Write a protein that binds this ligand. Structure first.
Ligand SMILES: *[C@@H]1O[C@H](CO)[C@@H](O[C@@H]2O[C@H](CO)[C@@H](O)[C@H](O)[C@H]2NC(C)=O)[C@H](O)[C@H]1NC(C)=O
Ligand SMILES: *[C@@H]1O[C@H](CO)[C@@H](O[C@@H]2O[C@H](CO)[C@@H](O)[C@H](O)[C@H]2NC(C)=O)[C@H](O)[C@H]1NC(C)=O
Ligand SMILES: *[C@@H]1O[C@H](CO)[C@@H](O[C@@H]2O[C@H](CO)[C@@H](O)[C@H](O)[C@H]2NC(C)=O)[C@H](O)[C@H]1NC(C)=O
Ligand SMILES: *[C@@H]1O[C@H](CO)[C@@H](O[C@@H]2O[C@H](CO)[C@@H](O)[C@H](O)[C@H]2NC(C)=O)[C@H](O)[C@H]1NC(C)=O
Ligand SMILES: *[C@@H]1O[C@H](CO)[C@@H](O[C@@H]2O[C@H](CO)[C@@H](O)[C@H](O)[C@H]2NC(C)=O)[C@H](O)[C@H]1NC(C)=O
Ligand SMILES: *[C@@H]1O[C@H](CO)[C@@H](O[C@@H]2O[C@H](CO)[C@@H](O)[C@H](O)[C@H]2NC(C)=O)[C@H](O)[C@H]1NC(C)=O
Ligand SMILES: *[C@@H]1O[C@H](CO)[C@@H](O)[C@H](O)[C@H]1NC(C)=O
Ligand SMILES: *[C@@H]1O[C@H](CO)[C@@H](O)[C@H](O)[C@H]1NC(C)=O
Ligand SMILES: *[C@@H]1O[C@H](CO)[C@@H](O)[C@H](O)[C@H]1NC(C)=O
Ligand SMILES: *[C@@H]1O[C@H](CO)[C@@H](O)[C@H](O)[C@H]1NC(C)=O
Lengths: 366, 237
């Protein structure tokens, strides 16, 4: 390549510049603060009692780190139904003020909780929007929400003057006039109560057992989002040319221990011209340095192809540790100019003919 | 629980000299032994700052608030546009225990106050609280002066704080002390005006406004801002 750069088949004695050596990163590391503030979902999923279908429990959720993997792998739940958001990508997506609507219904009517779905309780008790961005989780609770004498504590809305709008909760208990005469609070002709009790029994078959059903609604409005996954982190390595993503601040380099004393509220530092120099890992809370990976040109020292054929190679401004066909070659010498391979260091001193630098130079004997 | 207060206390609206106070850390970056020029919202040097010995005051862009209070009579703050349930509003209360930050459609009376009984418990600042959006609780904040800087940018409410013992009687001391960043809140309110809360038994504070301009800050070895220079005050500057 000396000949190729010179574009000649014969080369004169001297030292010539060539391509640039540069170290490459090995792997990647990511660090995020201690995953805490776990979002309180057990209080709504493992609550002792749930509300009626017509008076479903509505809860708001914000400022929490939600672990949806455990529910995703939860084998206790049977219905994990939703299409608006892919179930495995919840941890990636970030939202705010997730809504939880929980109740207990019959097993047969669990299908009624779906976008664009009708039925007996879908259009009367809890109606879903056609553009629903959420997910419904349902599971049998016959052993808990039923009585051997009959669970009569759960009621559902049966008769209504009109349907129910999506995301509407109507708990009004008023007599219904089914004819052309007022009821006046009398269960007379064309007069039926709007609420009817459930008849849950342990001996009831599949579809008649009480199922606990809760829908999660994800909304993302102009205010900043705050509810999403834990953002798993990797481990920490040192003294290696890598690339890093420290709490969103990303870049390449090599990291070492440092003795800087950050004031207790900073996260990183820089010297001049916007060049980051130190960081603080969000878990150990210690200060680490950053230096760029080594680079620099290479040069070839030759006595002239007329005289001999062997050469020497100089990596300038590079520590003699990340040396690597000429990875080993001959004995390697380290000088203030860089690292030299293919030459032998002596203790004599003569005139200078091929200047190398820092007060040293080379000649042909080897 | 509160009605119009007949005892219309008069706090004389005097003017005094801002001197060189009201400098806060503008970001969260460590710098050592460097001089950095930055353009941001600050309180211009040697300006008229209003001194009161609870009127409604405009918020403008940001507010520098100070009080050399003793026995901690200052209680809290109210923020919003109309300070009614008709509009989203914000409230800060700093009682004996943990401070409480609230964001709801609160309804106050003409004269909101706390009052104390001598048994030390009384709270009749507002009337109704129907729709709530944000809640938060933190550690209590508090011869000694307390300074705070309030900013509201991009749905982020930023509070910077600093308290320092004092010995001078009336005016603000002619010293320098940077303001470290205390709290950030991720709630958006189109605040236009604000108020104040006192502790009455059953009063001097200073207010200044911010402006956008350019400053030069000097960092010491440990990264603490130790002095600053305005860039639009004097030709020497
Ligand atoms: C982040 O969490 C880790 C996991 O526990 C903490 O590591 C240990 O925490 C215990 C108790 O806090 C300490 O007694 C150990 O000394 C920690 N191990 C270390 C430091 O190697 C870690 O302390 C947590 N850090 C923060 C800032 O919360
Ligand atoms: C090239 O890098 C190595 C590795 O850091 C340097 O060796 C260090 O030298 C210092 C100074 O004598 C010692 O305190 C360390 O213990 C050494 N570390 C190792 C792993 O040997 C070496 O000095 C560097 N090259 C030059 C020319 O300074
Ligand atoms: C200070 O105000 C709070 C309410 O703003 C008082 O009550 C506390 O309320 C919170 C909110 O649920 C509870 O978690 C605390 O347990 C309550 N007690 C505390 C913090 O002591 C509180 O009593 C007030 N402190 C006083 C009057 O000294
Ligand atoms: C209670 O207040 C909150 C916040 O002020 C309201 O939530 C949002 O308010 C903005 C105001 O412009 C609306 O544009 C959004 O559509 C609201 N989002 C949601 C999810 O409601 C909330 O609407 C208020 N509720 C009541 C009953 O007043
Ligand atoms: C502050 O006021 C501005 C209006 O000057 C609000 O911007 C409006 O927001 C609503 C709700 O999204 C939009 O329908 C309007 O088109 C917006 N108008 C303009 C001119 O932008 C802004 O949302 C308010 N912010 C807060 C936090 O109250
Ligand atoms: C800045 O940091 C330095 C380094 O810790 C501080 O200097 C130390 O101060 C303590 C307290 O007087 C001494 O015991 C140490 O011997 C000092 N060490 C050194 C290396 O000087 C210094 O106090 C801090 N603050 C300022 C304003 O410089
Ligand atoms: C409810 O309890 C079961 C049994 O321990 C548990 O597996 C499940 O994770 C709990 N639910 C939540 C939301 O934590
Ligand atoms: C090679 O160099 C020697 C002297 O160093 C010279 O005598 C000889 O002629 C050269 N050979 C060539 C130019 O082919
Ligand atoms: C001669 O040089 C070699 C390395 O080139 C060195 O190890 C040795 O100590 C030197 N000896 C003297 C006497 O200078
Ligand atoms: C405040 O304004 C008055 C006039 O109202 C003026 O005399 C005084 O110098 C001003 N003080 C300042 C700008 O610090």
């Amino acid at each position: 390549e000396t000949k190729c750069t010179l574009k000649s088949f014969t080369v004169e004695k001297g030292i010539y510049q060539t391509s640039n050596f540069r170290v490459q990163p090995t792997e990647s590391i990511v660090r995020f603060p201690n995953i805490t503030n776990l979002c309180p979902f057990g209080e709504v999923f493992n609550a002792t009692r749930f509300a009626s279908v017509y008076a479903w429990n509505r809860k708001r959720i914000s400022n929490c780190v939600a672990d949806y993997s455990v529910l995703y792998n939860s084998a206790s739940f049977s219905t994990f139904k939703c299409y608006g958001v892919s179930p495995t990508k919840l941890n990636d997506l970030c939202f705010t003020n997730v809504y939880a609507d929980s109740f207990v219904i019959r097993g047969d009517e669990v299908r009624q909780i779906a976008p664009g779905q009708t039925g007996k309780i879908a259009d009367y008790n809890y109606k879903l929007p056609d553009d629903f961005t959420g997910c419904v989780i349902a599971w049998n609770s016959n052993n808990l929400d039923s009585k051997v004498g009959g669970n009569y504590n759960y009621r559902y809305r049966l008769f209504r003057k009109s349907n129910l709008k999506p995301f509407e909760r109507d708990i009004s208990t008023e007599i219904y006039q089914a004819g052309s005469t007022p009821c006046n609070g009398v269960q007379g002709f064309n007069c039926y109560f709007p609420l009817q009790s459930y008849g849950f029994q342990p001996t009831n078959g599949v579809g008649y057992q009480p199922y606990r059903v809760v829908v999660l609604s994800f909304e993302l409005l102009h205010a900043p989002a705050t509810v999403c996954g834990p953002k798993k982190s990797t481990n920490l390595v040192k003294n290696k040319c890598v690339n890093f993503n420290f709490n969103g601040l990303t870049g390449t380099g090599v990291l070492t221990e440092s003795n800087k004393k950050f004031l207790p509220f900073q996260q990183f530092g820089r010297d001049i011209a916007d060049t980051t120099d130190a960081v603080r890992d969000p878990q150990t809370l210690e200060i680490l340095d950053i230096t760029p990976c080594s680079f620099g040109g290479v040069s070839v020292i030759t006595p002239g192809t007329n005289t001999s054929n062997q050469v020497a190679v100089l990596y300038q401004g590079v520590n003699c540790t990340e040396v690597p066909v000429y990875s080993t070659g001959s004995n390697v010498f380290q000088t203030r100019a860089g690292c030299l391979i293919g030459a032998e260091h002596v203790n004599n001193s003569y005139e200078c003919d091929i200047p190398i630098g820092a007060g040293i130079c080379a000649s042909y004997q080897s | 629980q509160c009605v119009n207060l007949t005892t219309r206390t008069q706090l004389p609206p005097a003017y005094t000299n801002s001197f060189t106070r009201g400098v806060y850390y503008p970001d969260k970056v460590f710098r050592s032994s460097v001089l950095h020029s930055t353009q941001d919202l600050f309180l211009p040097f040697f300006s008229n700052v209003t001194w009161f010995h609870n009127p409604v005051l405009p918020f403008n862009d940001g507010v520098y608030f100070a009080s050399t209070e003793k026995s901690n009579i200052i209680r809290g703050w109210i923020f919003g546009t109309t300070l009614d349930s008709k509009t989203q509003s914000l409230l800060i209360v700093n009682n004996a225990t943990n401070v409480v930050i609230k964001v709801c459609e609160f309804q106050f009376c003409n004269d909101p106050f706390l009052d104390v009984y001598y048994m030390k418990s009384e709270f009749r600042v507002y009337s109704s609280a129907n729709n709530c959006t944000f809640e938060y609780v933190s550690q209590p904040f508090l011869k000694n002066l307390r300074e705070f800087v309030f900013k509201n940018i991009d749905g982020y409410f930023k509070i910077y704080s600093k308290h320092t013992p004092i010995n001078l009687v009336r005016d603000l001391p002619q010293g320098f002390s940077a303001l470290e960043p205390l709290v950030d809140l991720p709630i958006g309110i189109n605040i236009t005006r604000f108020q104040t809360l006192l502790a009455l038994h059953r009063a001097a504070y200073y207010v200044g406004y911010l402006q956008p301009r350019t400053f030069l800050l000097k960092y010491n070895e440990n990264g603490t801002i130790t002095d600053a220079v305005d860039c639009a005050l004097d030709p020497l500057s």
